[PDB]
Amino acid sequence: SCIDTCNSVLEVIAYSSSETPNRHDMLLVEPLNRLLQDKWDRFVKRIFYFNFFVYCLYMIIFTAAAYYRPVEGLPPYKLKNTVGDYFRVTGEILSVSGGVYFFFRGIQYFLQRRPSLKSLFVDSYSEILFFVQSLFMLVSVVLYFSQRKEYVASMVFSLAMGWTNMLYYTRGFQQMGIYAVMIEKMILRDLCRFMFVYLVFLFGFSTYNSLYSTCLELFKFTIGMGDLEFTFIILLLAYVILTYILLLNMLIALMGETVNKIAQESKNIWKLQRAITILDTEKS
Amino acid sequence: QQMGIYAVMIEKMILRDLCRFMFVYLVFLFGFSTAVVTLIEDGKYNSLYSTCLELFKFTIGMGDLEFTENYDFKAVFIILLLAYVILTYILLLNMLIALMGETVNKIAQESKNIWKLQRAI
Ligand code: NA
């Protein structure tokens, strides 16, 4: 009573404000975990798999349509009486339809949920990312019909975001879903700290008579491609010792520490994500 | 005993960590390669295979960051390459090392028992 559906307990815990002390732990309570697993294995596994298949088809069609884009200049491009041109245009139409679908789904989520502008950009990262991909697609359409070739820039950012968003569907499989929660926690905590310090050091040591060229040359060192003679020796050696040999290995060590302490927290967050998916599937 | 346990650990790492890592890494690589090759107008790297190989070179410490110039919007190309590098090389490959360390920490007894069962067989 008032657990399955009512303010129901599951809808209270799942849609919490992200300040609740134990939002991730309240789902480990005896009857709730077994109820969510029952709902999953009964109907939400199949629905979620169908959604994943539909998204994979959408991304495949979008990739195919963008791959075979014409190179003539100043769109729109007139369609030729060729089967290939009829496949390309239908793929483009499907891509634009999916973008509109995701834009409207993001608007509906921001309306019915009313995030408080902090949990907006501190929780619900999936919704924002899909919405941002849809925004890129719509901006691409607008630029395309304005006779601007910058439509391709917006389209390729929509494609890389859409392919990186496939990591959303790792939830629904425990091992991959927890690995993806651990990727989120690495990005928010270790990559952020390392990137701040690393960027400060890089900009200082970079400050080839242009700032951009020298910054790129010094960044090549981070990826194992540094020249040491690209165009001084003490500065380059100091930069190498402080970034490559110290800061990048320290990042590995801190990543090892994080993984050791987030094991239980990563599983709870994945379970909460799947509970949110199960509630969304039930409501819609 | 020592080489036996080492091989068992290799088996466990191939089945768990390499698998999870390869799935996420291949998804990222294909997405970023489809974006880069779409941005490219023409030339030597206007094929999916060529761009995929160029972006995979980054994983092995041989990435160019300037392997082509047949495009418009150089900013778009640089941003895509930097995003791919930050997401794979600096994050995912180090996370793999960190997850491999955890696995080593947690599979000593399991790896010795499996080796003993192998020798019994
Ligand atoms: Na190298």
Closest Cα of chain B to A67: distance in Å? 5
Element (DSSP H or E) covering residue B8: helix B2-13
Label residues B65-87 b or e (16+ Cβ within 10 Å = b). bebbeebeeeebbeebbebbbeb
Considering Cα of A169, then A171, then A176, then A180, what sign does the dihedral take? positive
* Structure tokens belonging to residue A53: 């298949």
Under DSSP, the state recorded for A122 is T
- C-beta pairs of B62-66 under 8 Å, 24+ apart in sequence: B62/A224, B62/A225, B63/A223, B63/A225, B63/B89, B64/A225, B65/A216, B65/A219, B65/A220, B65/A223, B65/A225
| Rounded distance between C-alpha atoms, residue B110 and residue B98, angstroms | 20
Phi, psi of A3, rounded to the nearest 5 degrees: -110, -60
Please indicate whether, in this complex, the C-beta atoms of B38 and A153 are within 8 angstroms of each other: no
| Rounded distance between C-alpha atoms, residue A2 and residue A5, angstroms | 5
**How far apart are the CA of A232 and the centre of ligand 1, in A?**
21
| Rounded distance between C-alpha atoms, residue A81 and residue B14, angstroms | 51
Please indicate whether, in this complex, the C-beta atoms of B34 and A159 are within 8 angstroms of each other: yes
Look at residue B12 and give its three-state secondary structure. Answer: helix
Please indicate whether, in this complex, the C-beta atoms of A163 and B35 are within 8 angstroms of each other: yes
Q: What is the DSSP code string of A149-200? A: TTHHHHHHHHHHHHHHGGGGGGTTSHHHHHHHHHHHHHIIIIIHHHHHHHHH
* Structure tokens belonging to residue B105: 């920490």
Experimental structure resolution, Å: 2.3
Q: What is the gyration radius of the CA atoms in chain A, in angstroms?
A: 24
Experimental technique behind these coordinates = cryo-EM
User: Annotation-wise, does A91 bind a ligand?
Assistant: no
Residues of B in contact with A170 (CB under 8 A): 24
